[PDB]
Amino acid sequence: PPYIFSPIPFLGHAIAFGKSPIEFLENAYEKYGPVFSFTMVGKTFTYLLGSDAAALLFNSKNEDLNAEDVYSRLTTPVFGKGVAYDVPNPVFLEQKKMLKSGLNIAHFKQHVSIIEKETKEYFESWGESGEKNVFEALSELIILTASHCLHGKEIRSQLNEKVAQLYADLDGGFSHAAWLLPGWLPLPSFRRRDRAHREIKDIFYKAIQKRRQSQEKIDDILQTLLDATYKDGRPLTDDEVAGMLIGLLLAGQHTSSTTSAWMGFFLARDKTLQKKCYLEQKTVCGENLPPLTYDQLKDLNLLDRCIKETLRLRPPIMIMMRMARTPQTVAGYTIPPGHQVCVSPTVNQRLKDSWVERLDFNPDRYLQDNPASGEKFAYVPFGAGRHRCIGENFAYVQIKTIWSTMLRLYEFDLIDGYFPTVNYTTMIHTPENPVIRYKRRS
Amino acid sequence: PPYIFSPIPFLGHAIAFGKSPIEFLENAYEKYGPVFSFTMVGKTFTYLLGSDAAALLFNSKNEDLNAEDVYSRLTTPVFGKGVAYDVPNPVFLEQKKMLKSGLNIAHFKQHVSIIEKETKEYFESWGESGEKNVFEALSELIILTASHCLHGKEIRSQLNEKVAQLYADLDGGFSHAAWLLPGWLPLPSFRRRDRAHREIKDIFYKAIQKRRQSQEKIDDILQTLLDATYKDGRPLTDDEVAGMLIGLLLAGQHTSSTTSAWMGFFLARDKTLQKKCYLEQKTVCGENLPPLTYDQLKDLNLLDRCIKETLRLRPPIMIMMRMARTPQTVAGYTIPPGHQVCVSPTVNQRLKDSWVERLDFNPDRYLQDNPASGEKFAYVPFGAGRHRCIGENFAYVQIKTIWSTMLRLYEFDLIDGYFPTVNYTTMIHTPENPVIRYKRRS
Amino acid sequence: PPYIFSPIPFLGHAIAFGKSPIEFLENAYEKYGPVFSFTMVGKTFTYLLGSDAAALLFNSKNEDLNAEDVYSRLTTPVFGKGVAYDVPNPVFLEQKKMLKSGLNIAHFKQHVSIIEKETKEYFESWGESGEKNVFEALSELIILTASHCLHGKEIRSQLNEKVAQLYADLDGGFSHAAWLLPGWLPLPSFRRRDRAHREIKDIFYKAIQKRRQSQEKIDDILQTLLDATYKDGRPLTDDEVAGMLIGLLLAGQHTSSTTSAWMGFFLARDKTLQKKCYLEQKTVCGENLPPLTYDQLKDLNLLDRCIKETLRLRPPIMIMMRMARTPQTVAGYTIPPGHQVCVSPTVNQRLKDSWVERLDFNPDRYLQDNPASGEKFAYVPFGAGRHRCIGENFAYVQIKTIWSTMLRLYEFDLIDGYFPTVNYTTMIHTPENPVIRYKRRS
Amino acid sequence: PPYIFSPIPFLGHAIAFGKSPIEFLENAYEKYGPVFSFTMVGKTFTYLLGSDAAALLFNSKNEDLNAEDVYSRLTTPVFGKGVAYDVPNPVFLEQKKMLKSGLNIAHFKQHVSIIEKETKEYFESWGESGEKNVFEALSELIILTASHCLHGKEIRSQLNEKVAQLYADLDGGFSHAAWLLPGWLPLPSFRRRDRAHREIKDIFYKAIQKRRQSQEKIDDILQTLLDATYKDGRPLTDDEVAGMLIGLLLAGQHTSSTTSAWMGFFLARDKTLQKKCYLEQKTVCGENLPPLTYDQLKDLNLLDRCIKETLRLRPPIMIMMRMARTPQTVAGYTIPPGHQVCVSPTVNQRLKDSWVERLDFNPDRYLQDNPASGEKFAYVPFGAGRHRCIGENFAYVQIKTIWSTMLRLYEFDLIDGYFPTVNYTTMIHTPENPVIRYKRRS
Numbered sequence A, B, C, D: 001p002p003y004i005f006s007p008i009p010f011l012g013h014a015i016a017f018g019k020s021p022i023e024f025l026e027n028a029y030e031k032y033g034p035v036f037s038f039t040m041v042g043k044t045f046t047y048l049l050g051s052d053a054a055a056l057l058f059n060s061k062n063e064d065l066n067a068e069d070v071y072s073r074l075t076t077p078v079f080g081k082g083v084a085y086d087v088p089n090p091v092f093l094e095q096k097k098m099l100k101s102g103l104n105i106a107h108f109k110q111h112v113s114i115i116e117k118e119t120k121e122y123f124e125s126w127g128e129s130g131e132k133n134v135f136e137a138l139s140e141l142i143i144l145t146a147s148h149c150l151h152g153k154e155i156r157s158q159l160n161e162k163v164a165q166l167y168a169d170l171d172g173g174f175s176h177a178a179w180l181l182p183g184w185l186p187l188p189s190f191r192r193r194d195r196a197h198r199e200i201k202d203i204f205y206k207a208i209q210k211r212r213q214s215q216e217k218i219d220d221i222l223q224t225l226l227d228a229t230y231k232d233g234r235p236l237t238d239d240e241v242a243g244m245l246i247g248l249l250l251a252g253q254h255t256s257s258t259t260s261a262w263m264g265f266f267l268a269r270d271k272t273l274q275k276k277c278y279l280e281q282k283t284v285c286g287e288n289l290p291p292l293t294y295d296q297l298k299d300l301n302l303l304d305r306c307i308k309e310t311l312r313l314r315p316p317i318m319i320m321m322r323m324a325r326t327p328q329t330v331a332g333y334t335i336p337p338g339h340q341v342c343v344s345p346t347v348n349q350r351l352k353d354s355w356v357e358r359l360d361f362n363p364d365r366y367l368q369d370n371p372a373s374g375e376k377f378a379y380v381p382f383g384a385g386r387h388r389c390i391g392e393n394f395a396y397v398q399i400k401t402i403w404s405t406m407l408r409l410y411e412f413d414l415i416d417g418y419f420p421t422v423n424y425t426t427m428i429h430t431p432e433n434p435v436i437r438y439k440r441r442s
């Protein structure tokens, strides 16, 4: 595959790529095509851009394009041993079926009123009007809603600011330092990550032992997990459950919070589209805006397309990476073992040749013919194939319910017309200076 | 000097020291005496503990024990060029005087009313009661109070969340990453630091030119700097002044916020003492508690001793360090060039030899024979000698005014008896989980 | 407990203790009594000498005096994950019961004829007379006998010089280097350990899979493991089984080889005794000396007492150690958490107070009153309590079968009256210059 | 010079280089050219690849590129005081001339018949055929031949298993632990080294005095040392002679044994070549293969080239290193003091640019134009300049004699076509699993 030369030793394209990766990759697509390699910080990466190329990653077996080889070093200290990329993929495929089994309609029905209430109670602190950081706000809110829904009421009631900070300490295990440096260096963020892991695990161990002795029946996701079994017939251990609960919260929080914050700003920019979203609430749920229900959520189809469009333009997982263990073919090229193969939903979901008015925020594009339905891997915010997301439905419930409630409470505006740029320096591309103006809804 | 061997290559005692640096130094004192050496992360350090040993550092000439050699590389990219450790010491000493001339009675009198107002207005958001993170609050207030007083009303008014983040980016330049790794690595913290430095220097350039061309006589710290002059007769360039303004704010924020936070918890744990600090407010300023004046602050003796005692047990600057350029002598040992010589106010200030009830918060210890007055270098939170603090006066005015105001507003308590342990992983040590219970002062 | 001062910082008494540990301990016993402490290498050790003091260690719960804390770091890379000190003690206790059920009379009956044949065949290479290193011979023979018996014929057949070297590479994981230095140094011994671990594991995985698939009923230790289940109901994984096989071989080899070597020299020195052992072979087994059977072993009483007395004077596991997790009281003292508590079989088994003619090799001492029967923890070559050995019976079958065969083959003598001194530079103390004179018996 | 950056603090490229040093250096050569630098375990190494660059090291004065500075620490405890890297280089140069005078034709003529006899006698144990470890056999054989030739018959008669172990203890002085850790630590290897040194010295002292007080005339290497003088007129002390005698054995053994073993396998792999070597024996010595003589060894040309080609592909001393004491210039670069400057015989002797079919074993490459005669430092298995070997002639006598003899006894083959890979974990690279098939020669 074509190789993009850089005269800068070791660093290669690091600076330019870090500054503007989408522009870097779109320029390369124009110049070298859908498949190309480059060096950055001592590693070779090979990209697959566009649906046809990306299909290799999305279709391939883990034995060929391996996820653990790239992610385990970073994730295993955060999520825990015996879970995710710390086990053989077939074990993780079973754990994912266990998790999926609890993300069902019965539970989603319960989650809606829990989330709505959590949201209304959080935003009382915003008062009738002002200008505040909506990203910080959603982050704090989403850690509460995710915990309430995915861990349950017992665990959620223990999530004070201390435990919230522990989760922030775990997050800090995902850094440039952790990627670049050996783990045996006693860096503060490493020690803080390991401390938080031990302390959260302990919180979960007690809660789990409590639940196991309890005589009561509780139909929640925790209970799905205590009841689950492998094809073996073997149940999950306390440590496996706890590892899974940590994963559920990290997965549940940052992908929803960034996406909810970008959509706030897309809707703040497009005031008519926001108005429409608010009017859809009256139409579907009634003029008197009663408590939200799951059945009503399915009927919020404009808000649905708005979320869908937010994920097109700002997918919170911007990249999917694998390690090539065996030789792989695409577009006539042969990628050898050792290349790290990458896909970028951001680049694919915005490619000129497939998306008309690619840079425009337009939810209604999905009511016409479009690459989301017309192609296989042009729209891939939740991935596809063996490593694909199991949380799309929950995420949509969480975000829909939060933004429905937020729309009912407030009208949102840009400050001096400013639309946030993308902060590329964070692992997750958050909107820069994400302060939003708000005032009471009519 | 006796060497504390570690068989661990490169790291040396890094892990044990990072976990509990104070306890590590106290144990070393008990086993090796007041002067000892060790390796940490590639480097040789020699400590001077106790008053008699520490004197070598405090009385030393910067030619012999050198500050720039150990600090320049980390500070120059934060504060700026031609300032602090980026210039020969004799030049920096003149800049300290320029700054000191501006930290005077007349200006302190203006600051009291300003700081008091900032404090009342910030703490409206807390309402009548609740449980909130006092450390975060004090950090947010103090950046305002420190800017209002040290920079001016004009620069202050421009201090929004965005610019406040710019300052945090600048704090982020003091990291292990920055200490360990080459500066040309495009790490996010490095870039943000360099970006934040240009954007702040620029906000200063604009206010520095506004003032020089204005006709209005304003008597403030900013003006003192603009008027000030070297022994040459040379005035300060815009960039010399701006860099000093940066230093001023970093010097004036977290030293006072951590300390202020700790005193909060010391007073929350000892209610009887808290009560007495409140009654002293009445007793000194009047039953009706009128606006504060600089004169009233000098008569707040119990409050003064609470601050002094907070600084004894939790000094924000845990270590002062120099590079030995010439052979030094102390307690019968000779320290060779290349060694880094260290003093710790924290250790000196709780040494078993010299402080009774050493770990107790007892502000009335200073009403009796004690090493603060009894010895020269046992109590040294603001250092001593050629490098000692010039902001001590302003720090007490800031902290006294805020906590006087805070005690008038609220009575503070612990949550479930918890006293914050020390977070050693932050540059300045911080209280862990520093959420405090508060309610309206009768 | 009384503390034994050393003026040598860091090392403390390590030199003297490395040279003459038994003498150090015996003199400390006389001077300080049965419980005392000292420092080496920044680590504080407390000894319990004599039956009454040792009782604390042997009787303690692992939650109080903990083996993992002191052994896990070295053993886990050797034996593998999920086994021995890498799991909570209760799981290891179940693992030990699985192993113990495999060490039964039906298997012992098979082992005697396996071991006799391996022994006759190995010693073909010794011819009619000569002078050779018995210790090397016993080590080479025992790795075959232990693998043949404990792993089975399939795995045994794959035990060539290459695999033997891999086991030596695993052994090399137990070193002063692995104890003293951190694991992230890429030392040759660590790399060879880790490679040997993967390569030995791989051999076991194939043999394990072979047997599961196979339809033939084989009654051997491997099969005991494949058929075993935890109280859980859960069977062992392939990796747990392989880990346990590695452990079986390492436990089965050096403990028997060193003891057998020592017994060789004790018998070479006391020719009258050696003759009596030879004649007991004729008396018990028959004048024509037919093949050994398991049932004759129990009637070989003199030989039994010879092994007992060799273990008395030369126990191959010369120390047992634990980390104190909770305060422990003995002899009026309180041992605090953090001390490593320590017993020596060697010292207990020769203490002047209880053993008459304590340094004499006198197998017949057990035919009158003696500390092994009259005291609880004076004779403890295989330990006692929760960490006690499961392999005593096997070791006696192995050693008796080998030495019965050797006595039938050869008469052994010393070389110019030399009796080997103890080599304290090896992990398990070996006899120095263990070359022995032999000639065809009768 | 270009620097190869590693983001791995301290360790630098330690792991990658230790895994595959030749591949590392050859890749570096391609990317950076003949001179480059990198960090490994806290040290800066600068390599000179190819003849023209390596010239700097081989042509350098010891005052500029110093050998004691890098080697002294490890070698002195092994060889003894007063010898080799423990004295200034001019003194060692004189000592080398003394050894040179001992390694003369009169002595070599004696050695051939000594070596042939030890060889025939040693391989008696091998029988008519089998599969045995040729590397271990050669190592054991060579310690005997080297000691018989270089120490004489008296000392050699005392070389039992015990003494051979003392020599292994000595070699054990050359460890990563001795490189990393202070000499005062009483580590096993340090203790065994120093004990072995004392005991071997005592064997040499008696033998030496035995000769000085004797009347017989013995023309052997010891006598040359005893009759030798410095320019001073000063003769060697007993400790100088004994130090040199240790050096002679350690240099004489492993360099020849590893090289001999590699050649076994090159010859077993290339049976046509092996047959030609056997036929050469008959051609030069005669059909009846009488006792070897020195004059015959000189005419065994094909065997000479097989050795030369073995040293080409597997030089036992893989690196030559010096401390830069003064700035040096090469390839338009300046190497500052403190850099460790290195040459790799293995890379030079394999370079893509110079050697056609670079990885082929082709002894006849030397009968055409080739870089061993066409360039100065492409072929340097024995070094060059002030530090070059004085043992090449003895080596060639020892190896030729042993293999001529082995070729007369046996034909050799690979086992299942396995060619030993390189074991990079040993000080001297060794062949992995060096068991070889052999059968009585026609």
Ligand code: HEM
Pocket (backbone or CB within 6 Å): A067, A096, A248, A251, A252, A255, A256, A259, A315, A316, A317, A319, A320, A321, A380, A381, A382, A383, A384, A386, A387, A388, A389, A390, A391, A392, A394, A395
């Ligand atoms: C808007 C919300 C979310 C987005 C955009 C998102 C995105 C993704 C993507 C792109 C992948 C594929 C990763 C890859 O191919 O390497 C993925 C996998 C996954 N996600 Fe999500 N996700 C979301 C929410 C959630 C939630 C709520 C959960 C759990 C409740 C979750 C759990 C997972 C899991 C378990 C995987 C599987 C990873 C693997 O098998 O390697 N996600 N997600």
Ligand code: HEM
Pocket (backbone or CB within 6 Å): B067, B096, B248, B251, B252, B253, B255, B256, B259, B315, B316, B317, B320, B321, B380, B381, B382, B383, B384, B386, B387, B388, B389, B390, B391, B392, B394, B395
């Ligand atoms: C509680 C508040 C503060 C504490 C505990 C504190 C402590 C110290 C200490 C210990 C030193 C000595 C550093 C050394 O010699 O290595 C010092 C120096 C200094 N402080 Fe502060 N300080 C505080 C507040 C301030 C403030 C508010 C300013 C300015 C407004 C300031 C400006 C300085 C300056 C300019 C130096 C001299 C640096 C040098 O000479 O190297 N400090 N401070």
Ligand code: HEM
Pocket (backbone or CB within 6 Å): C067, C096, C248, C251, C252, C255, C256, C259, C315, C316, C317, C319, C320, C321, C380, C381, C382, C383, C384, C386, C387, C388, C389, C390, C391, C392, C394, C395
């Ligand atoms: C002469 C031969 C042997 C001796 C002297 C010996 C000695 C010991 C001793 C003293 C302990 C207690 C360790 C402690 O408390 O820290 C022990 C434990 C043990 N031995 Fe042996 N042993 C021998 C042979 C074997 C054999 C043949 C096996 C297996 C077949 C074996 C397996 C074990 C196991 C599993 C433990 C348990 C360790 C623990 O629970 O922490 N041993 N042995």
Ligand code: HEM
Pocket (backbone or CB within 6 Å): D067, D092, D096, D248, D251, D252, D255, D256, D259, D315, D316, D317, D319, D320, D321, D380, D381, D382, D383, D384, D386, D387, D388, D389, D390, D391, D392, D394, D395
């Ligand atoms: C195949 C066998 C041998 C090889 C490949 C070999 C290789 C070398 C090499 C490459 C050097 C240069 C060291 C440097 O420049 O850093 C050297 C030096 C030396 N060799 Fe050998 N050698 C061998 C056998 C011997 C023997 C048999 C002796 C003595 C009988 C010996 C004694 C020496 C001595 C004394 C030096 C001088 C070291 C110095 O001056 O720094 N070598 N050898």
Ligand SMILES: O=C(N[C@@H](Cn1ccnc1)c1ccc(-c2ccc(F)cc2)cc1F)c1ccc(-c2nnc(-c3ccccc3)o2)cc1
Pocket (backbone or CB within 6 Å): C070, C071, C074, C075, C079, C083, C084, C095, C099, C174, C175, C176, C179, C243, C244, C245, C246, C247, C248, C250, C251, C252, C255, C317, C389, C391, C427
């Ligand atoms: O090999 C170890 N223990 C042995 C003790 N043993 C042998 C026979 N009966 C008991 C061992 C323990 C458990 C097992 C084992 C356990 C479970 C199983 F299924 C199979 C085997 C096998 C063993 F060989 C071992 C080795 C070294 C150390 C060690 N810890 N610290 C050091 C140390 C300290 C200072 C300097 C050098 C080494 O060494 C601890 C344990």
Ligand SMILES: O=C(N[C@@H](Cn1ccnc1)c1ccc(-c2ccc(F)cc2)cc1F)c1ccc(-c2nnc(-c3ccccc3)o2)cc1
Pocket (backbone or CB within 6 Å): D070, D071, D074, D075, D079, D083, D084, D095, D099, D174, D175, D176, D179, D243, D244, D245, D246, D247, D248, D250, D251, D252, D255, D317, D389, D391
């Ligand atoms: O044994 C060493 N050198 C050998 C090199 N040699 C062998 C044959 N021809 C030359 C050597 C050098 C001088 C002599 C010698 C000296 C004097 C004399 F009278 C006779 C012989 C003998 C030798 F064996 C030696 C070994 C190790 C090291 C060493 N330096 N660093 C390391 C090292 C570094 C990192 C990790 C581990 C080891 O190892 C340096 C020299």
